Amino acid sequence: MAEMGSKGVTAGKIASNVQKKLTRAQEKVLQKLY
């Protein structure tokens, strides 16, 4: 009932890692698109 154990932080850590790469690119596009 408590979601504090965290058994997927690492399984998604990898994703948060790839998503961080999207931000750097997101900053570039944000300047050309808008």
- Cα–Cα distances (Å) from 20 to 5, 7, 11, 24, 30, in that order, read 24, 21, 15, 7, 15
Residues in the chain: 34
Q: Is the dihedral of CA 34, 27, 22, 10 positive or negative?
A: negative
For residue 11, report the phi and psi dihedrals to the nearest 5 degrees.
-65, -25
Q: Is the dihedral of CA 14, 16, 19, 23 positive or negative?
A: negative
The tokens describing 13, both together, are 């850590």
CA distance 7 to 29: 35
**Which uninterrupted H or E stretch holds 34?**
none
DSSP codes of every residue in 8-25: SHHHHHHHHHHHHHHHHH
